[PDB]
Design a protein around this ligand. Structure first.
Ligand code: MG
Ligand code: MG
Ligand code: ZN
Ligand code: ZN
Lengths: 449, 449
C-alpha cells in the first residue's frame, strides 16, 4: 500500500564536498511520519535479528559496501527508529548484569522477562515462561524460525526451548549440563528435543550434527533425533533445490531444513585483524567465499521461502529471522566476515520489507541482541589490540579495531542500540525502550492472549 | 499546557526480575507519537551537544547514575529519535574520512557543508560559509552560545569563526598556523577575534586565558582582547553571582561570561582507568569535585540564564549548549569525569525541556558531534587497554574499557549515533540522517532564507 511508506532514498543527495550535497533528506518528514503510524492490529510479524549488530557494525558495513553517504535498502529503510537496552540479570542476586549474552537477550524479547546469561526460556528462578512462538502457535498462527547458525544456538533456540543452559544442545550434553531438563531426569528435554516438540511450521538453519545424537528416554528412545523427526511427520531438506520444492508447510507436515552440520557458511572471507595491522599491513578488500554454494540457500532465500509458506495461513504468522554470523565474525576479529553477514541480512530485510509493503498488515522489526567489539577509528591509529584497514566502496581506507579482549575472543558490549520498525504498532520502538518491551509490543500487535 | 508531550517516565516499571517488570512502556505509543508531530514554525531553537556522547557514553552514565532500569529525565525524555552519520572529508581527495574531529562536525551542523578535520566554518577549498548563528542574528533572532570548554574550542567556535585550523585560538597562534586569517596579514582574524566580531547576544564558557593576548592590528591593535571586548560594549562576568545579576543581554549589551582560564571544572573526581584495572584494582566510586564550586555556574545554570535573557527577544532565539567535558574525559580514560559530565548535560537538558514544554514553539535537539572510545564490558574482562570497575546505583559493578589507542589519548569512533528532539519539526531527526541535514532542519524550522 502506498499507505505505509518506507525510506526509499536516504543516501547523500549530491556532491559531498558541496553545500547540502551530503544531505540525506529531500524535505520535511512530518507528513511521512504521520502516515507511518497505525494502531491497527498486525496480521503478521517478521522479526529480523542481527546477532551483535550494534550501530557500529551497521555503520562499518554501510561505509564498506555502500560508502559513507551510502544507504542500506533493507536495514536503513525502516522509518521508525529508537534505542533499546538489553542488560541481563545476575543469577545469585537479581541485580543487573550490564553485558548480556544471546541466551539472556533472546529470552527477553521472546518471553518478556529478564534472565541470567546462559539461560533459555527460564527466569532467574529457573522457571519456564511461554515464548512468543508457543503463544502465536497456540493462537493458531503459522510460526517460522530461521537462522544461519546451528538451530541449537541461543538465538533461534529461545523461541522453542527451556533450559538452564544454552550448552544443552542434545541429550548427551543436557544429561550433564542440564540434568533437570534431561529427558531421563524427568525434565522437558534437550534443546533439540524441545525444538522438535515445539513444532514451528517452518524451521531453517544449521546444526544438523546434534540431530545424530540418540534419545536416552521417551517414545523415541534409541532412535536418532533426526529419525524421531521424520517419525514425527516432519519434512526434512538439506539443500536449496529441495528447500525450493516445498509447496506447503504446517503442523501436519512441518518443515525442518538442515543446511549444515554447524553454522551455515559465511558470505565473505578476509584475513583476521592483527596487532597494528592497519599500519604494518596493507588495506584489505574482502573475498567472497568460493565455498558458499549454489545448493545452499542464502538467508534472503530461506526468508522468501519462509514467507511464502507461512503466508498461506489466513489467521497470520510469526517469523523470526536471524543473521547469526555478524556476532561470530566480530568475536573472531574478522571484518570481512563481519561485514558480509551484515550485507547478507540487509537482503533479507529487503524481502521482508517488500512483502510487508504490499501486504499492509505486517509489522517488521530490525534489531540486534546486544552490541559488539568493533570500532571505526582513524587510519593512522596505533591500537593496543587488533586492527585492519579496508578499501571501501568510496575508494578510501576505513580502519576497524577490536580492543576489548586479550583473550582469543572479542567481547560483547553493553551499549544501548538501534531498533527500527515499519508497519502497525511500530511506534512502540521509538525513543528509549527495553528489550523486554519488544515481547509485549509483539504479543500486543497480534492480539495474543 | 504542553500541547506536545515529552516522555515523563521510561524507567523500568517494576521488579526487573519479574515478568514485565523491566518494561519501560505502560502501553501503546501510537497516539502520543502522533501528538509529537507538528510542522508549525519554530520561534526558538535550543541545540544541546554532548561532545563525544555516543550511545555507549549514554548507557554507561545511566547505568552508573540511574541504574540499568533508570531513566535520564532529560536525555532519555525526547520522544523522537534516530541515528545520524558524521563522517568528515579528506582535504585533498575530497573522499570521506570515516572518523571526524569536533571541528569538521560542528561545521557540518552549523553550515550544511562537510569539511576536513580541523576546519572551522570553512569548506575543503577553505571557502567560508555562513553559520546558523550568523544567519539567525541576521534575521533579527537573539543568539546564544554556551559551553563548558574554552570558548575557542571547536564546538562553540564553529558558530562564530571561520579559520583553516582549529588551533588558531588567538593572535599569536593564528599568525603561525592560520597566516591567511591573521589580522596583520589582512585576515578576518583569530577565533577569539571573530568571536568578538560575531557579537552573539549571549556567550558563556571558559577560555579567559586567550583574552589576555593583544591584537596585532586594527582598531584595537596592542590592547588585550579583554579590553577590546570591554571597549566594544560587552558585559563581562566571571562568576555565578555576577552572571545572576545580569538583567539584560542584547546587540547593545552583549554578554560575555569567562568563568575559567581554560575549561570549566569537571563535576566528579575519580582515578584514570588502567591496565587490567578491573582485576588488579577495587571498584571505584565517583566523588564530587570540590573545585566544582559555588562561585562557578554549572551548565544547567548558564542554560537557565541564557534562556531567560534570550527569551526576551520577540522574534525568537537560537541557542547552542555544549557539555564539553564528556569527550575530554573520554580521551583521558576517566570514567568518573566522563559520566559526571554526562549527568551535568542531563540537567541542562531538563531545563531546556521544561521551558520548551511551556513555550510550545521551541525545538529541542539532543545529540553529539561524534562517537568515542568508551565501552561497557563484562566484569571479568581481560583487556589490552585501560579498564576500571565502578560501583553503580544498582549496587552492582560495571566495567568500562578504553582500548583504541596506545597513545595518551583515546580516539574518537566512527559509529553513527543517537539524535533526539522535541517540538515542531522534530520528525526530521527520525530514521537515518546526516549531521548536515540538521543544519537544514534548524534553518527551515526557524524559517530562514
Ligand atoms: Mg545468535
Ligand atoms: Mg567540544
Ligand atoms: Zn549475540
Ligand atoms: Zn575529542
Amino acid at each position: 500500500t502506498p499507505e505505509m511508506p518506507v525510506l526509499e532514498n536516504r543516501a547523500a543527495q549530491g556532491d559531498i564536498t558541496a553545500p547540502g550535497g551530503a544531505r540525506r533528506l529531500t524535505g520535511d518528514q512530518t507528513a511521512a511520519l504521520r502516515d507511518s503510524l497505525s494502531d491497527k492490529p498486525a496480521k503478521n510479524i517478521i522479526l529480523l535479528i542481527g546477532d551483535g549488530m550494534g550501530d557500529s557494525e551497521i555503520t562499518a558495513a554501510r561505509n564498506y559496501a555502500e560508502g559513507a553517504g551510502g544507504f542500506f535498502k533493507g536495514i536503513d529503510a525502516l522509518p521508525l527508529t529508537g534505542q533499546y537496552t538489553h542488560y541481563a540479570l545476575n543469577k545469585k542476586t537479581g541485580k543487573p548484569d550490564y553485558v548480556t549474552d544471546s541466551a539472556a537477550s533472546a529470552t527477553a524479547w521472546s518471553t518478556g522477562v529478564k534472565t541470567y546469561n546462559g539461560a533459555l526460556g527460564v527466569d532467574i528462578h529457573e522457571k519456564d515462561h511461554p515464548t512468543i512462538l508457543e503463544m502465536a502457535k497456540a493462537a493458531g498462527l503459522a510460526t517460522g524460525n530461521v537462522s544461519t547458525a546451528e538451530l541449537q544456538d541461543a538465538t533461534p533456540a529461545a523461541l522453542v526451548a527451556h533450559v538452564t543452559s544454552r550448552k544443552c544442545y542434545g541429550p548427551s550434553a543436557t544429561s550433564e549440563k542440564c540434568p533437570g531438563n534431561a529427558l531421563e531426569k524427568g525434565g522437558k528435554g534437550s534443546i533439540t528435543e524441545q525444538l522438535l516438540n515445539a513444532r514451528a511450521d517452518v524451521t531453517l538453519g544449521g546444526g544438523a550434527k546434534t540431530f545424530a545424537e540418540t534419545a536416552t528416554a521417551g517414545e523415541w528412545q534409541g532412535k536418532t533425533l533426526r529419525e524421531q523427526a521424520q517419525a514425527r511427520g516432519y519434512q526434512l531438506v538439506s539443500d536449496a533445490a529441495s528447500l525450493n520444492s516445498v509447496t506447503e508447510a504446517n503442523q501436519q507436515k512441518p518443515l525442518l531444513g538442515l543446511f549444515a552440520d554447524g553454522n551455515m557458511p559465511v558470505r565473505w572471507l578476509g584475513p583476521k585483524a592483527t596487532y597494528h595491522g592497519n599500519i604494518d599491513k596493507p588495506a584489505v578488500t574482502c573475498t567472497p567465499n568460493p565455498q558458499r554454494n549454489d545448493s545452499v540457500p542464502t538467508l534472503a532465500q530461506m526468508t522468501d521461502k519462509a514467507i511464502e509458506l507461512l503466508s498461506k495461513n489466513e489467521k497470520g504468522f510469526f517469523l523470526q529471522v536471524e543473521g547469526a554470523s555478524i556476532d561470530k565474525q566480530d568475536h573472531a576479529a574478522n571484518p570481512c566476515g563481519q561485514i558480509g553477514e551484515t550485507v547478507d541480512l540487509d537482503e533479507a530485510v529487503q524481502r521482508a520489507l517488500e512483502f510487508a509493503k504490499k501486504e499492509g498488515n505486517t509489522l517488521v522489526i530490525v534489531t540486534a541482541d546486544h552490541a559488539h567489539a568493533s570500532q571505526i577509528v582513524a587510519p593512522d591509529t596505533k591500537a593496543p589490540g587488533l586492527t585492519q584497514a579496508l578499501n571501501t566502496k568510496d575508494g578510501a581506507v576505513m580502519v576497524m579495531s577490536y580492543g576489548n579482549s586479550e583473550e582469543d575472543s572479542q567481547e560483547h558490549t553493553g551499549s544501548q542500540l538501534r531498533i527500527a520498525a515499519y508497519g502497525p504498532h511500530a511506534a512502540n520502538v521509538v525513543g528509549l525502550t527495553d528489550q523486554t518491551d519488544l515481547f509485549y509490543t509483539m504479543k500486543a500487535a497480534l492480539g495474543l492472549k
